[PDB]
């Protein structure tokens, strides 16, 4: 269990960290886009309805 750190002797941290950044940003963007494409969770439209902003 304790030895998980040895992965950094087999991968270069530059490559891993860039891949992590790309991975996490894409995942976050994908999730926010799905919520925006879900009418029950599109916060801009929820607010528009709540405050009677259209007509």
């Amino acid at each position: 269990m304790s030895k998980f750190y040895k992965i950094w002797m087999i991968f270069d941290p530059r490559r891993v960290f860039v891949a992590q950044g790309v991975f996490l940003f894409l995942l976050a963007v994908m999730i926010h886009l799905i919520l925006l494409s879900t009418p029950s969770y599109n916060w801009l439209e929820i607010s528009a309805a709540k405050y009677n902003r259209v007509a």
């Binding site: 270069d12 490559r15 790309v22 894409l26 963007v29 994908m30 999730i31 886009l33 799905i34 494409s37």
Partner: protein, 49 residues
């Protein structure tokens, strides 16, 4: 034997289709899948060890 760049091209092709499908769903249009999947797979293909 398979060279690192040949492996990189294979994985980039897998990444292209997988990222393409998920962003095509998330973006609500297949072109969003092509743009995101393409640029990510190109970044992957350009970067062998």
């Amino acid at each position: 034997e398979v060279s690192e760049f040949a492996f990189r091209l294979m994985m980039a092709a897998v990444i292209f289709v997988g990222v393409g499908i998920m962003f095509a769903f998330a973006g609500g249009h297949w072109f969003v899948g092509l743009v995101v999947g393409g640029l990510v797979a190109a970044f992957f293909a350009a970067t062998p060890n």
